[PDB]
Design a protein around this ligand. Structure first.
Ligand SMILES: [K+]
Ligand SMILES: [K+]
Ligand SMILES: [K+]
Ligand SMILES: [Mg+2]
Ligand SMILES: [Mg+2]
Ligand SMILES: [Mg+2]
Ligand SMILES: [Mg+2]
Ligand SMILES: [Mg+2]
Ligand SMILES: [Mg+2]
Ligand SMILES: [Mg+2]
Ligand SMILES: [Mg+2]
Ligand SMILES: [Mg+2]
Ligand SMILES: [Mg+2]
Ligand SMILES: [Mg+2]
Ligand SMILES: [Mg+2]
Ligand SMILES: [Mg+2]
Ligand SMILES: [Mg+2]
Ligand SMILES: [Mg+2]
Ligand code: NA
Ligand code: NA
Ligand code: NA
Ligand code: NA
Lengths: 141, 113, 47, 77, 128, 56
RNA sequence: CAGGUGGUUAUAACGUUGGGGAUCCACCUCUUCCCAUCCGAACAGAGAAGUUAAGCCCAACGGUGCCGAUGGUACUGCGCAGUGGGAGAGUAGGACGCCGCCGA
RNA sequence: GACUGGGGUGGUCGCCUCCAAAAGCGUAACGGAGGCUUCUAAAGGUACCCUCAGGCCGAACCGGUCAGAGUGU
RNA sequence: UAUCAUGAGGUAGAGCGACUGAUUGGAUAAGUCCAGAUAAACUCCGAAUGCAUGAUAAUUACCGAUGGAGUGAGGGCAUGGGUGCUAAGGUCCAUGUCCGAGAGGAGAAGAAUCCGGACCACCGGCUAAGGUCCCGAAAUAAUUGCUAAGUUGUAAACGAAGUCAAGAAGGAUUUUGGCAUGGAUAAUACACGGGCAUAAGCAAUUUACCGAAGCCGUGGGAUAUA
């Protein structure tokens, strides 16, 4: 489970996700990847499940990069607790993403293997996804 | 820490309080290893009103008397230019020694300050 | 240990009210202050 | 349970009071600030709490010098 | 190692003009470098095939309808964050002197070769 | 040098500054027409309330 | 041939390479007096033994800093992206200052 | 005694600073964080003179590259 | 209120090899270098709006002093946020707006959604939103497409691609668009408001017309300024 080793502040205001991702929207470090098409909070459990899927596929070959990191703490109130009286109990960390942000990247496997593995990873994520490849890629060899 | 920057800091400190106008011009002094130069400056215009130095002036062998002669000369030049009130600028030097003699001689002359 | 201090020895009388730390300054504080009655500077001492 | 927060001090109404180009009488307060966000210049005095005020009557001028340092001055007559 | 391209002149600028250009399936492009002011023009998404391509095809010969003809190389490309479509192209005009640094594909220790058009100083490409 | 401005939409639910711009132009009723010399200030007024008025 | 003192927010700064010297500046020589620090290193005084080595000034250098378009994009006002405003970063490039007064 | 996402229990009640605060000022929550109920006879005034912290080399001292230190709280 | 002139910003955005926190790959515990990337309590930067002052222009009630108050339970919508579960017809602020204190028209019927501010009368006319087959006022109007599901006339991940276009690579493959199709679901009896319609559905365009207590016309009053 990805989460910061230390943090300055325990609580964070629930911000707002606004437009498209202007950084991290281009395939760097790899040849194939998947971009989000929605705005959402991605949890560490979802990230780990998707990474496990994409690594169980492709066998032992290739390399996989995860490009987002959960560093936003969230809280939950709890059953029987009324509104008010401060923040609730901490319940982990999330990464907020907007459409265009690349979540997963792979390199070192053929086109079909990459496409299938990234499909498998995308099926465990809470956002609809687009599969992308680097534009200077050669389809053969 | 070069002596140039050491004097530049003191020059900035002195200019933090002392500035010259057409009335009460700034009397700035340069020492050097020999001779001594005195200038009367109107700062709002960036224009020198009077000057004096010991480059063509030589009467004794000791810098204190030479500085006194320069002070008398600059008092004369200022009174000829129509200057009676000034403000002295240390120009980064301690007010003691040759500059003290120059200022004292300028007091013995005109330049009521 | 910080307390009110009264300076006296005027001429009515001239008083000044200041503060001091008595543990730090056990001895009596005495300073020259302006005297309105005599219109000059006189030595005032803590009472 | 309970919250350990809930405190806040009163706002001090800081900021620029007379902007560049306006006319200021003598003694008018120009800026309320903490420290020297703006430094005094010609015909401008600075108080104990770094309040900038006019020493004369004229037009307020804001200027910028080296290191983007901001100066407030008064142009008179 | 020589692409051919033609450009419709562009004189309207702004978000409105760029949207109007892109609605009819074309790309705003600028060309600068060396002496002389830059040239603004419009190319077509079909016309650009040096972008979705394996090699670094230097020497794009551009004929701009309102201007002369130049030999340039790809300098900057802007993509849409979501659709990955091409939204703007900037070309750097290469001259006889003033060598231009670019990226040249690597085969296994090989390259594609840059001696003409561009002078020298090729950095690398896909140095994995 | 002169323009005729006619109010064609209601000021109900419009912001108070737009209502005051209508008042400054002289339009207080629907379909009212005002004639003004087309100065930059008048044109700026018309631009501010452009969605409520028509130049005839 | 160099010095002093100012305006202009480093396009002005820093740096590398090379060249100065009859006097101008400087390094340099000595502490009796003025004056100063454990120390004449700094500060202060005494007059000319030697140096351009260093400071300083000049010239070349686009090296580190600094500045920086056009086009596009982000964002945004109008209660509709129809009609207006329009970055930041980056890329072309620029830049080894520009204006005064005094003395020689 | 009051506040109070019913009341009670628990917490809080005056002042200071940051964020919430939407690039003037102002602006709420039992929203998020911290402090105070002093101190200095010099830690006040003025003239004059200085410049921290960090990395490296040598063995508190030397050397030259460099706003991080301090400003009682 | 608008225009012009002038001025201070630290929000949106961006950036972080500018700092402080967090941080991902590497090439060579530590450090350097390269590269990728983040923030209410980060900033090397930095808008649009808003704000202050002055002058013009247009246009009506802005301040002094005094007599009389009521109110100090607010609410919905849009926008920027906190809180909550990016729940609530939830709750706490900010900027507008409306209901409150507001009738009239459309939406079947709805406090604040869309249009529009009612002096009185009229068996006159033009329009708004929205409409023109019948209930029900006005086109069974004109032209061109799409849909075959009565979809329509008032929910998703994920399938198949039913159909119509627009392409790209090489009759097959693949991409982008429109409209449909499965996923689709509880209890007194159901819904386009109903009839019903293959256009009387959806998209576009044009011309007429209908349509309010809005506007105009006619008659009659009242309250203020000139
Ligand atoms: K621009
Ligand atoms: K309220
Ligand atoms: K309905
Ligand atoms: Mg505060
Ligand atoms: Mg820019
Ligand atoms: Mg109670
Ligand atoms: Mg504010
Ligand atoms: Mg604001
Ligand atoms: Mg932001
Ligand atoms: Mg009450
Ligand atoms: Mg109340
Ligand atoms: Mg409510
Ligand atoms: Mg009521
Ligand atoms: Mg009302
Ligand atoms: Mg009609
Ligand atoms: Mg009918
Ligand atoms: Mg119906
Ligand atoms: Mg009427
Ligand atoms: Na509060
Ligand atoms: Na820059
Ligand atoms: Na830039
Ligand atoms: Na149905």
């Amino acid at each position: 489970m990805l989460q910061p080793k230390k943090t300055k502040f325990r609580r964070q205001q629930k911000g707002r996700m606004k437009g498209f991702a202007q950084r991290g929207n281009q395939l760097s470090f790899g040849s194939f990847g998947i971009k989000s098409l929605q705005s959402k909070w991605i949890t560490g459990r979802q990230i780990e499940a998707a990474r496990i899927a994409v690594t169980r596929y492709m066998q032992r070959q290739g390399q996989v990069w995860v490009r987002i990191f959960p560093d936003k703490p969230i809280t939950k109130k709890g059953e029987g607790v009324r509104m008010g009286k401060g923040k609730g109990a901490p319940e982990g960390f999330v990464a907020p993403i907007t459409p265009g942000r690349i979540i997963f990247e792979v390199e070192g496997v053929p086109y079909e293997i990459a496409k299938e593995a990234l499909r498998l990873a995308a099926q465990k994520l809470p956002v609809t996804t687009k599969f992308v490849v680097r534009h200077d890629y050669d389809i053969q060899n | 820490v070069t002596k140039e920057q050491r004097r530049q800091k003191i020059k900035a400190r002195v200019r933090g309080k002392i500035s010259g106008t057409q009335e009460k011009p700034r009397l700035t002094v340069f020492r050097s290893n020999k001779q001594i130069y005195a200038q009367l400056i109107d700062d709002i215009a960036g224009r020198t009103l009077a000057s004096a130095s010991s480059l063509k002036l030589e009467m004794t062998g000791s810098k204190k008397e030479i500085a006194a002669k320069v002070g008398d000369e600059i008092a004369k030049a200022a009174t000829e230019a129509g200057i009676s009130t000034v403000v002295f600028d240390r120009n980064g030097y301690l007010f003691h020694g040759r500059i003290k003699e120059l200022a004292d001689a300028a007091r013995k002359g005109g330049l009521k300050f | 240990l910080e307390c009110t201090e009264h300076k006296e020895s005027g001429m009515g009388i001239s008083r000044y009210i200041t503060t001091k730390n008595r543990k730090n300054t056990t001895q009596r504080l005495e300073l020259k202050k302006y005297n309105p009655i005599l219109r000059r500077m006189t030595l005032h001492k803590e009472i | 349970g309970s919250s350990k927060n809930g405190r806040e001090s009163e706002s001090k109404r800081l900021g620029v009071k007379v902007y560049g180009g306006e006319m200021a009488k003598a003694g008018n307060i120009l800026v309320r600030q903490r420290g020297t966000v703006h430094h005094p210049g010609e015909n401008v005095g600075i108080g104990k709490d770094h309040t900038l005020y006019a020493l004369k009557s004229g037009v307020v001028v804001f200027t910028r010098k080296k290191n983007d340092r901001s100066y407030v001055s008064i142009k008179t007559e | 190692k020589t692409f051919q391209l033609t450009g419709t002149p562009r004189a309207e600028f702004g978000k409105k003009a760029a949207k109007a250009i892109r609605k009819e399936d074309q790309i705003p492009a600028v060309l600068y470098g060396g002496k002389g002011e830059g040239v603004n023009f419009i190319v077509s998404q079909d016309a650009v095939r040096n972008l979705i391509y394996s090699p670094e095809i230097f020497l794009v010969e551009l004929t701009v309808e309102g201007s002369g003809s130049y030999k340039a190389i790809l300098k900057e490309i802007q993509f849409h964050p979501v659709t990955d479509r091409i939204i703007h192209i900037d070309f750097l005009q290469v001259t006889d002197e003033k060598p231009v640094v670019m990226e040249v594909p690597v085969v296994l220790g090989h390259a594609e070769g840059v001696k003409a058009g561009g002078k020298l100083s090729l950095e690398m490409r896909k140095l994995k | 040098a002169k323009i005729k401005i006619q109010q064609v939409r209601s000021r109900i639910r419009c912001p108070k500054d737009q209502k005051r711009t209508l008042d400054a132009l002289g339009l207080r009723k629907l379909n009212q027409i005002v004639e003004h010399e087309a100065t930059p200030s008048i044109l700026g007024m018309v631009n501010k309330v452009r969605h409520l008025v028509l130049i005839v």
